[PDB]
Scaffold this active site. Structure first.
Site, PDB file in Angstrom:
ATOM      1  CG  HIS A   8      -0.213   0.036   2.424  1.00 27.52           C
ATOM      2  ND1 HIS A   8       0.457   1.033   2.904  1.00 27.52           N
ATOM      3  CD2 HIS A   8      -0.246  -0.977   3.493  1.00 27.52           C
ATOM      4  CE1 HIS A   8       1.145   0.710   4.107  1.00 27.52           C
ATOM      5  NE2 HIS A   8       0.758  -0.387   4.510  1.00 27.52           N
ATOM      6  CD  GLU A  74       3.071  -5.355   7.997  1.00 30.19           C
ATOM      7  OE1 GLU A  74       3.625  -4.834   7.326  1.00 30.19           O
ATOM      8  OE2 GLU A  74       3.687  -6.651   8.349  1.00 30.19           O
TER       9      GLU A  74
END
Length: 170
Positions: A8, A74
Site C-alpha cells: 500500500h 500486516e
C-alpha cells in the site's frame, strides 16, 4: 501461480519510521498519488485486499474492486504499534531485521503471521492482484530467497511458489 503483491501507499508512520501493523492509519496525499499511479499499470486480474483502510484505499485508487480478507493484514505489533524504531529495544530491532525470533508483546508471532499469509496464498486458484503490506511482501520474497524490501506503493509479481517474475516501481 502468478501473483501480484502490492504494498500500500505511504502512511504518515511509514515516513516517520514507526511500526505500523493493525493500527488503521490512512494514506497520506502522496500515498494516494502512488496508488493512483498503479491504475492501468497492473494487470486487471481479480483483486483481494487486506481489510485495513490503507490497503483497501490503495486497491480502490488503483482501479480495483477487491474482496476483503484479514489474512492479508500486516503483522500485529501489539504494544509495539506506533513504536518509534529509534528507541525500539535492540532485541526487537534485531529480530525484525533478521525476520526471525520476533513476537511483539500482545501482537502476533512472526511464525503465526507467516503461516496465515502463506496459507492464504495456497487458497488462490487463478492469478490475482493482492493489495497488502510490506511485511507480507517481505515474507513471500524471503521465502523465495530474495530480499523483500520494496517501496510503498510499488508491486512485485511472483510465480509462487517458485520464483519472482518482475518488480514494478514507478
Amino acid at each position: 501461480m502468478e501473483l501480484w503483491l502490492v504494498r500500500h501507499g505511504e502512511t504518515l508512520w511509514n515516513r516517520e519510521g514507526r511500526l505500523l501493523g493493525w493500527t488503521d492509519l490512512p494514506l497520506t496525499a502522496e500515498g494516494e498519488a502512488q496508488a493512483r499511479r498503479l491504475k492501468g499499470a497492473l494487470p486487471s486480474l481479480p483483486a483481494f485486499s487486506s481489510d485495513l483502510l490503507r490497503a483497501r484505499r490503495t486497491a480502490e485508487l488503483a482501479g480495483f474492486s477487491p474482496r476483503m480478507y484479514p489474512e492479508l493484514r500486516e503483522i500485529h505489533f501489539g504494544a509495539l504499534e506506533g513504536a518509534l524504531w529509534e528507541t525500539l529495544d535492540p532485541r526487537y530491532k534485531e529480530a525484525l531485521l533478521r525476520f526471525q525470533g520476533f513476537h511483539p508483546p500482545g501482537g502476533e508471532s512472526l511464525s503465526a503471521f507467516q503461516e496465515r499469509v502463506f496459507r492464504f496464498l495456497e487458497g488462490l486458484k487463478a492469478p490475482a492482484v493482492l493489495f497488502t503490506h510490506g511485511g507480507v511482501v517481505r515474507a513471500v520474497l524471503r521465502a523465495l530467497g530474495e530480499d523483500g524490501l520494496v517501496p510503498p506503493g510499488s508491486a512485485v509479481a511472483v510465480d509462487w511458489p517458485r520464483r519472482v517474475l518482475v518488480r514494478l516501481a514507478l
